[PDB]
Amino acid sequence: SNALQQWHHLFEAEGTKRSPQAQQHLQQLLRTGLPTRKHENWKYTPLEGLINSQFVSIAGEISPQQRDALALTLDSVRLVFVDGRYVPALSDATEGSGYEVSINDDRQGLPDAIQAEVFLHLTESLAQSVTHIAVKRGQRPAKPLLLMHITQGVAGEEVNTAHYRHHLDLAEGAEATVIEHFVSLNDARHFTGARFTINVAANAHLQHIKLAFENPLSHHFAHNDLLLAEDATAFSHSFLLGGAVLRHNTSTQLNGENSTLRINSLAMPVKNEVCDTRTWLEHNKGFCNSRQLHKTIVSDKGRAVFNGLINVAQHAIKTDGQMTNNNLLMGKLAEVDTKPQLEIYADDVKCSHGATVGRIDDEQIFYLRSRGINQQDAQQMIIYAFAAELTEALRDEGLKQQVLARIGQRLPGGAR
Amino acid sequence: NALQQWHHLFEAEGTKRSPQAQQHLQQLLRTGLPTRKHENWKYTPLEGLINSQFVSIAGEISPQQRDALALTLDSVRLVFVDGRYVPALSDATEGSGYEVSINDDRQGLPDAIQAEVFLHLTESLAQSVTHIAVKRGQRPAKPLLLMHITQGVAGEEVNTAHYRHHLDLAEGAEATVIEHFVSLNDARHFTGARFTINVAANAHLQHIKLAFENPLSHHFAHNDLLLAEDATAFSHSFLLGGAVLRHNTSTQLNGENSTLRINSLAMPVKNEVCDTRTWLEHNKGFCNSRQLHKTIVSDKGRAVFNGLINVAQHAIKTDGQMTNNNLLMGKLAEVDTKPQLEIYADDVKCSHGATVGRIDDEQIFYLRSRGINQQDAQQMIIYAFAAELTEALRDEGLKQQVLARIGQRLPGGA
Amino acid sequence: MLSIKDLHVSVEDKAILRGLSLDVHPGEVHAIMGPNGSGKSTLSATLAGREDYEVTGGTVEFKGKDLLALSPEDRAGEGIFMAFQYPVEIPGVSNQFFLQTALNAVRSYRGQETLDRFDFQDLMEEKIALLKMPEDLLTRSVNVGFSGGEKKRNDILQMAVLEPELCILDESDSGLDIDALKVVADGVNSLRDGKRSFIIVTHYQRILDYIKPDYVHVLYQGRIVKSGDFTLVKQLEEQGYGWLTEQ
Amino acid sequence: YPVEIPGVSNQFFLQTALNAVDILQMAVLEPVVADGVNSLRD
């Protein structure tokens, strides 16, 4: 099997009116080829379970009952996507919601990639449609927009693959919360690709949340972009809790002065899984403040990978950027690779990065247990304390409890 | 091109090349020269070096020229000029505690901890190897000083000299070794160095490196530190010379209960690029390591930091920290820092941090509002910034000479 | 209620306790003393359930059950509570959430019900007062920002709230002066109901002036080699032991 | 809000400021707080 050939085949599949944009990304995809473990950005992320596999794109259909059984409990404006396809019958109406929504394959407006890379090109080229979302000037929707993704694998050794593409434009003064939720229909492995680009205009405020909760055997490769103008505010929270191999990228450009940015993420790989969380940040204008908190909890035979690039352009005075990566290792076979990368070309700044690696504080666990709390609960209380700063940033208790439930379920002293 | 010329220099004396040297030359020609696209070469320019016409000639220098460039210090001084050990200029080592042999026999040399292009170049071109050893339990009365004096030639050619030394501290041995690099004059040259040290059980090593070459030269070095169990090692590098300097210190902690400290100071001014790099492997558990790398970048200068710490599986009780603090002085100053971690053991305490910013705007005003002019105020702060590193030099006389070298790069000039 | 017989315990293969025997009945206060290195910490660690303490011989029975087979939380359920020499800080976990969770746990075990939210608070207030604790205890993180003296007092508050049967003070008098000692004493003494028992592993003797023991025991190379009542403390002073005094 | 200057001792600080030309610095540099300020009334 030749992955590039397979994907090329899916691109040419009979009955596919692919856009010029998609065609350009296909060429880039075939131009760059697949990286090896010798490539600067791929020393720790395995592609073996992908490079030599047969790929198919089977768009099935599910019932509201199946959707509900996997859906989050939340009052939102929910758009449902199944195996790479928007499913109207399973989605909520958007009229009067505060969100202008159109789903089609017209891509004339989409911005160029901040950081071009092989899997971003793959998704752009195989996405069957683009979700055009916009929030008009000064509008602050009452409910969060929820993009629910349901992907399924097929019987056999073939790997069903679906690629999702969404773009959000937050006009001046607009303030919205958008959530991307990914789940697997069943235990069959699948290859999920996703790309959510977002443009944040002046005085606009974004609350972005990503919940990748797919099964243990799937591959999840995504690349989101955040473009901020001046006086813009953007918060992005990612909880990568699923998949055999997951690689998420968030590339950002602060193209306006006086903006505030926060990008957080939690990686929780369990037995044999690899969770790769990466960010790319450009402080192109001065007077912006950026904060990043990426935490990982690795269980026996799991591997967390962090990569955080921060470039501060010359003239970007008064830049205030921080990045923190705290890693907690659960067993003697767990692994973690972290690579912060700072490129600072302005002196009048305050930039810093910090990363820690260690195991859960056993003295605290024993203390809790000596008062009567069982091992499982003591451990959960401490992990929750560890992730508290990330989960509380959700600013939504109801949602927070479901994310915590997902976290607690992946702990050794819980289910394993 | 550069690779062709170096190959020529290797063959110009082919008859005298050791098998190991030949093996490194092969690896050099195999891997070739990196581009700005290579993972570890994004910020360090090689153009000023690879577009040159090279030569490698050894000239004679008098005791007077040596004395004028030498450090004021009581030590056992070995002198190397234009790539070679010079008997007539070196101190006698008889009864000093240091067993010294200079020859091209490389049979006992350990393999490279981290092989790379310039390490191969140096191994392949070095005329000979300085075999240094300190017997078990022995503690030499004086520190060993290896003074290197390299000169460029008149014209456009770039004279290149490559030095190679290996120090072996037997069990229980304790010794301090100083590497001093100076330029005979203003003519530019390409200096290559490689100092490998084997620290045995219970041995205690103190390593100091003073790269004080001229403003136009290139300095590419790679040192290796190998520690057994219950061993201690402190390495302090003050990289204050050369137009482009790239220094690597690769280390392996192969025994439990060892202590390691590796520090470096870089102060790139006027279109200089100073590249300080470390590679550390905690192969066994129960070891403590600390790294403090500070830079002060001033004009169009660029400081580059790269630090990788790998903690092998089961290396429990590892306690490693790495800190890179960067001070930018002007609007055109630059700094690129990549502290990295590959941790494969859970019962450990590993952390790293990197900071980048300008002089504390509040400390300066407070000082100025008391009568101190701006420059003096900034110098005080710069010195306080570098003091954490300079204070590691217990020999006051040595420390003062290092501070004076630092002063040459300050606004006032002192 | 507690019976320790011919207990042998080693740490990292070093024999620490070499045949320690002790008998504690309901309503008794026992003081264990002696020099450093003779077993104080190993005894406490073994009873609490620290996992790095190898019991190579002997027995420890509590309420007719083998205690050594119980996990730490079950020993607490059974009724054993230990005031740490070094109370642990739990950042991100409020004393309220901690105590509430602990109380429910031991109440569940033991087959009873826990207090009712607001009642739990009427209990706290009463205890925060009894031990001169910060009124904003419930919302702060367990022992974070507390001095050594405050951490010791917090542990006693825990003791009074979780209501154990056998209370062990593991050199928790260390670093405390007459004032703190007196407050700690008022906390422990308030727990004397004639049924609960106490084991005071002394750092120093002064604590025994406020919490008078019924029994006093002296350790020597991991064994109790002398027992008596409170008057024994004065007798030991005549031996000139260096460990007997100076905090 | 007095400013902190790590690495620089008051001695070097004061000596440098003096040869160049809080209440303590005011008294030492001669340009409970009151008694410190009033004593400088010449």
PDB file of N, CA, C and O in Angstrom, chain B residues 144 146 167 169 175-181 195-197 204-210 223-225 232-238 247-249 261-263 392-393:
ATOM      1  N   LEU B 144      45.632  22.276  35.651  1.00  0.00           N
ATOM      2  CA  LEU B 144      46.261  22.090  34.353  1.00  0.00           C
ATOM      3  C   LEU B 144      45.669  23.132  33.413  1.00  0.00           C
ATOM      4  O   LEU B 144      44.451  23.287  33.334  1.00  0.00           O
ATOM      5  N   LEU B 146      45.594  24.438  29.469  1.00  0.00           N
ATOM      6  CA  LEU B 146      45.897  24.123  28.079  1.00  0.00           C
ATOM      7  C   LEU B 146      45.626  25.423  27.332  1.00  0.00           C
ATOM      8  O   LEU B 146      44.474  25.804  27.119  1.00  0.00           O
ATOM      9  N   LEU B 167      41.402  13.666  28.573  1.00  0.00           N
ATOM     10  CA  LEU B 167      41.788  13.599  29.978  1.00  0.00           C
ATOM     11  C   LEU B 167      41.100  12.433  30.658  1.00  0.00           C
ATOM     12  O   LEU B 167      39.897  12.206  30.487  1.00  0.00           O
ATOM     13  N   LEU B 169      40.538  10.840  34.421  1.00  0.00           N
ATOM     14  CA  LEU B 169      40.647  10.968  35.864  1.00  0.00           C
ATOM     15  C   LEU B 169      40.329   9.600  36.437  1.00  0.00           C
ATOM     16  O   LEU B 169      39.182   9.147  36.384  1.00  0.00           O
ATOM     17  N   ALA B 175      40.856  16.875  39.887  1.00  0.00           N
ATOM     18  CA  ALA B 175      41.629  17.834  39.116  1.00  0.00           C
ATOM     19  C   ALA B 175      40.797  18.898  38.418  1.00  0.00           C
ATOM     20  O   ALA B 175      39.628  18.681  38.070  1.00  0.00           O
ATOM     21  N   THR B 176      41.420  20.054  38.234  1.00  0.00           N
ATOM     22  CA  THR B 176      40.814  21.176  37.552  1.00  0.00           C
ATOM     23  C   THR B 176      41.612  21.367  36.266  1.00  0.00           C
ATOM     24  O   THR B 176      42.851  21.348  36.285  1.00  0.00           O
ATOM     25  N   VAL B 177      40.909  21.514  35.149  1.00  0.00           N
ATOM     26  CA  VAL B 177      41.565  21.749  33.873  1.00  0.00           C
ATOM     27  C   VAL B 177      40.947  22.980  33.208  1.00  0.00           C
ATOM     28  O   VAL B 177      39.723  23.147  33.194  1.00  0.00           O
ATOM     29  N   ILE B 178      41.803  23.846  32.674  1.00  0.00           N
ATOM     30  CA  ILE B 178      41.363  25.067  32.015  1.00  0.00           C
ATOM     31  C   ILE B 178      41.762  25.069  30.531  1.00  0.00           C
ATOM     32  O   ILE B 178      42.907  24.764  30.185  1.00  0.00           O
ATOM     33  N   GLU B 179      40.806  25.395  29.667  1.00  0.00           N
ATOM     34  CA  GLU B 179      41.048  25.498  28.233  1.00  0.00           C
ATOM     35  C   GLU B 179      41.029  26.987  27.949  1.00  0.00           C
ATOM     36  O   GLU B 179      40.032  27.653  28.232  1.00  0.00           O
ATOM     37  N   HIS B 180      42.108  27.507  27.384  1.00  0.00           N
ATOM     38  CA  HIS B 180      42.188  28.922  27.063  1.00  0.00           C
ATOM     39  C   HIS B 180      42.490  29.058  25.567  1.00  0.00           C
ATOM     40  O   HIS B 180      43.459  28.482  25.072  1.00  0.00           O
ATOM     41  N   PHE B 181      41.653  29.803  24.852  1.00  0.00           N
ATOM     42  CA  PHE B 181      41.850  30.015  23.417  1.00  0.00           C
ATOM     43  C   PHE B 181      42.047  31.493  23.088  1.00  0.00           C
ATOM     44  O   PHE B 181      41.199  32.319  23.418  1.00  0.00           O
ATOM     45  N   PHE B 195      37.765  18.289  23.304  1.00  0.00           N
ATOM     46  CA  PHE B 195      38.338  17.834  24.562  1.00  0.00           C
ATOM     47  C   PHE B 195      37.383  16.803  25.165  1.00  0.00           C
ATOM     48  O   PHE B 195      36.254  17.132  25.516  1.00  0.00           O
ATOM     49  N   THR B 196      37.828  15.549  25.250  1.00  0.00           N
ATOM     50  CA  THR B 196      37.008  14.481  25.821  1.00  0.00           C
ATOM     51  C   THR B 196      37.593  14.098  27.181  1.00  0.00           C
ATOM     52  O   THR B 196      38.806  13.934  27.325  1.00  0.00           O
ATOM     53  N   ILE B 197      36.720  13.953  28.170  1.00  0.00           N
ATOM     54  CA  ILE B 197      37.135  13.643  29.528  1.00  0.00           C
ATOM     55  C   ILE B 197      36.400  12.439  30.106  1.00  0.00           C
ATOM     56  O   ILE B 197      35.170  12.360  30.034  1.00  0.00           O
ATOM     57  N   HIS B 204      36.563  13.612  40.815  1.00  0.00           N
ATOM     58  CA  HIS B 204      35.975  14.944  40.838  1.00  0.00           C
ATOM     59  C   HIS B 204      36.654  15.833  39.811  1.00  0.00           C
ATOM     60  O   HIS B 204      37.858  16.114  39.908  1.00  0.00           O
ATOM     61  N   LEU B 205      35.871  16.282  38.836  1.00  0.00           N
ATOM     62  CA  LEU B 205      36.380  17.137  37.776  1.00  0.00           C
ATOM     63  C   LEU B 205      35.832  18.549  37.761  1.00  0.00           C
ATOM     64  O   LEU B 205      34.627  18.772  37.947  1.00  0.00           O
ATOM     65  N   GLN B 206      36.728  19.503  37.540  1.00  0.00           N
ATOM     66  CA  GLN B 206      36.316  20.883  37.362  1.00  0.00           C
ATOM     67  C   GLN B 206      36.897  21.280  36.007  1.00  0.00           C
ATOM     68  O   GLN B 206      38.113  21.212  35.800  1.00  0.00           O
ATOM     69  N   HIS B 207      36.021  21.675  35.087  1.00  0.00           N
ATOM     70  CA  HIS B 207      36.420  22.080  33.748  1.00  0.00           C
ATOM     71  C   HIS B 207      36.026  23.520  33.470  1.00  0.00           C
ATOM     72  O   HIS B 207      34.888  23.924  33.718  1.00  0.00           O
ATOM     73  N   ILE B 208      36.982  24.302  32.981  1.00  0.00           N
ATOM     74  CA  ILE B 208      36.724  25.696  32.645  1.00  0.00           C
ATOM     75  C   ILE B 208      37.206  25.939  31.218  1.00  0.00           C
ATOM     76  O   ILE B 208      38.288  25.490  30.831  1.00  0.00           O
ATOM     77  N   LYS B 209      36.400  26.632  30.427  1.00  0.00           N
ATOM     78  CA  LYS B 209      36.795  26.927  29.056  1.00  0.00           C
ATOM     79  C   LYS B 209      36.678  28.418  28.802  1.00  0.00           C
ATOM     80  O   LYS B 209      35.637  29.017  29.066  1.00  0.00           O
ATOM     81  N   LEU B 210      37.757  29.012  28.303  1.00  0.00           N
ATOM     82  CA  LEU B 210      37.788  30.444  28.019  1.00  0.00           C
ATOM     83  C   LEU B 210      38.084  30.642  26.534  1.00  0.00           C
ATOM     84  O   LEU B 210      39.238  30.586  26.108  1.00  0.00           O
ATOM     85  N   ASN B 223      33.080  19.014  23.061  1.00  0.00           N
ATOM     86  CA  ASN B 223      33.686  18.287  24.173  1.00  0.00           C
ATOM     87  C   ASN B 223      32.750  17.168  24.651  1.00  0.00           C
ATOM     88  O   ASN B 223      31.532  17.261  24.496  1.00  0.00           O
ATOM     89  N   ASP B 224      33.330  16.121  25.232  1.00  0.00           N
ATOM     90  CA  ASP B 224      32.558  14.996  25.760  1.00  0.00           C
ATOM     91  C   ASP B 224      32.917  14.764  27.216  1.00  0.00           C
ATOM     92  O   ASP B 224      34.090  14.825  27.597  1.00  0.00           O
ATOM     93  N   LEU B 225      31.902  14.502  28.030  1.00  0.00           N
ATOM     94  CA  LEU B 225      32.110  14.212  29.441  1.00  0.00           C
ATOM     95  C   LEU B 225      31.463  12.861  29.711  1.00  0.00           C
ATOM     96  O   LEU B 225      30.289  12.645  29.376  1.00  0.00           O
ATOM     97  N   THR B 232      31.751  13.411  40.268  1.00  0.00           N
ATOM     98  CA  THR B 232      31.297  14.793  40.227  1.00  0.00           C
ATOM     99  C   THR B 232      31.989  15.509  39.066  1.00  0.00           C
ATOM    100  O   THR B 232      33.162  15.259  38.783  1.00  0.00           O
ATOM    101  N   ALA B 233      31.257  16.391  38.392  1.00  0.00           N
ATOM    102  CA  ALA B 233      31.811  17.150  37.279  1.00  0.00           C
ATOM    103  C   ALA B 233      31.138  18.511  37.141  1.00  0.00           C
ATOM    104  O   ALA B 233      29.911  18.613  37.137  1.00  0.00           O
ATOM    105  N   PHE B 234      31.961  19.548  37.052  1.00  0.00           N
ATOM    106  CA  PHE B 234      31.501  20.922  36.884  1.00  0.00           C
ATOM    107  C   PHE B 234      32.187  21.484  35.648  1.00  0.00           C
ATOM    108  O   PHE B 234      33.418  21.507  35.580  1.00  0.00           O
ATOM    109  N   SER B 235      31.405  21.925  34.671  1.00  0.00           N
ATOM    110  CA  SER B 235      31.973  22.508  33.455  1.00  0.00           C
ATOM    111  C   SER B 235      31.464  23.932  33.294  1.00  0.00           C
ATOM    112  O   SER B 235      30.258  24.168  33.256  1.00  0.00           O
ATOM    113  N   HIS B 236      32.398  24.875  33.207  1.00  0.00           N
ATOM    114  CA  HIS B 236      32.080  26.289  33.062  1.00  0.00           C
ATOM    115  C   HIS B 236      32.717  26.830  31.789  1.00  0.00           C
ATOM    116  O   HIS B 236      33.934  26.775  31.623  1.00  0.00           O
ATOM    117  N   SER B 237      31.894  27.360  30.895  1.00  0.00           N
ATOM    118  CA  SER B 237      32.406  27.902  29.649  1.00  0.00           C
ATOM    119  C   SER B 237      32.051  29.365  29.489  1.00  0.00           C
ATOM    120  O   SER B 237      30.898  29.766  29.684  1.00  0.00           O
ATOM    121  N   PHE B 238      33.059  30.159  29.141  1.00  0.00           N
ATOM    122  CA  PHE B 238      32.879  31.583  28.917  1.00  0.00           C
ATOM    123  C   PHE B 238      33.273  31.796  27.462  1.00  0.00           C
ATOM    124  O   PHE B 238      34.453  31.848  27.107  1.00  0.00           O
ATOM    125  N   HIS B 247      29.727  25.888  20.329  1.00  0.00           N
ATOM    126  CA  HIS B 247      30.308  24.957  21.287  1.00  0.00           C
ATOM    127  C   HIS B 247      29.322  23.902  21.772  1.00  0.00           C
ATOM    128  O   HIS B 247      28.234  24.228  22.238  1.00  0.00           O
ATOM    129  N   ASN B 248      29.720  22.641  21.674  1.00  0.00           N
ATOM    130  CA  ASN B 248      28.891  21.524  22.124  1.00  0.00           C
ATOM    131  C   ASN B 248      29.580  20.836  23.294  1.00  0.00           C
ATOM    132  O   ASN B 248      30.797  20.672  23.294  1.00  0.00           O
ATOM    133  N   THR B 249      28.796  20.434  24.283  1.00  0.00           N
ATOM    134  CA  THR B 249      29.322  19.660  25.393  1.00  0.00           C
ATOM    135  C   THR B 249      28.335  18.510  25.484  1.00  0.00           C
ATOM    136  O   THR B 249      27.178  18.725  25.842  1.00  0.00           O
ATOM    137  N   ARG B 261      27.229  19.577  36.707  1.00  0.00           N
ATOM    138  CA  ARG B 261      26.860  20.963  36.512  1.00  0.00           C
ATOM    139  C   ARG B 261      27.539  21.405  35.227  1.00  0.00           C
ATOM    140  O   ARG B 261      28.729  21.156  35.029  1.00  0.00           O
ATOM    141  N   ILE B 262      26.771  22.023  34.338  1.00  0.00           N
ATOM    142  CA  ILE B 262      27.316  22.529  33.083  1.00  0.00           C
ATOM    143  C   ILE B 262      26.737  23.922  32.866  1.00  0.00           C
ATOM    144  O   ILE B 262      25.514  24.091  32.768  1.00  0.00           O
ATOM    145  N   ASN B 263      27.615  24.919  32.817  1.00  0.00           N
ATOM    146  CA  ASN B 263      27.194  26.296  32.616  1.00  0.00           C
ATOM    147  C   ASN B 263      27.937  26.918  31.446  1.00  0.00           C
ATOM    148  O   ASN B 263      28.999  26.438  31.037  1.00  0.00           O
ATOM    149  N   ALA B 392      31.410  31.263  40.067  1.00  0.00           N
ATOM    150  CA  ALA B 392      31.765  29.849  40.162  1.00  0.00           C
ATOM    151  C   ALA B 392      33.286  29.698  40.089  1.00  0.00           C
ATOM    152  O   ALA B 392      33.834  28.622  40.337  1.00  0.00           O
ATOM    153  N   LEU B 393      33.961  30.786  39.733  1.00  0.00           N
ATOM    154  CA  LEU B 393      35.418  30.783  39.639  1.00  0.00           C
ATOM    155  C   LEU B 393      35.964  31.215  41.001  1.00  0.00           C
ATOM    156  O   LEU B 393      36.024  32.403  41.309  1.00  0.00           O
TER     157      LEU B 393
END
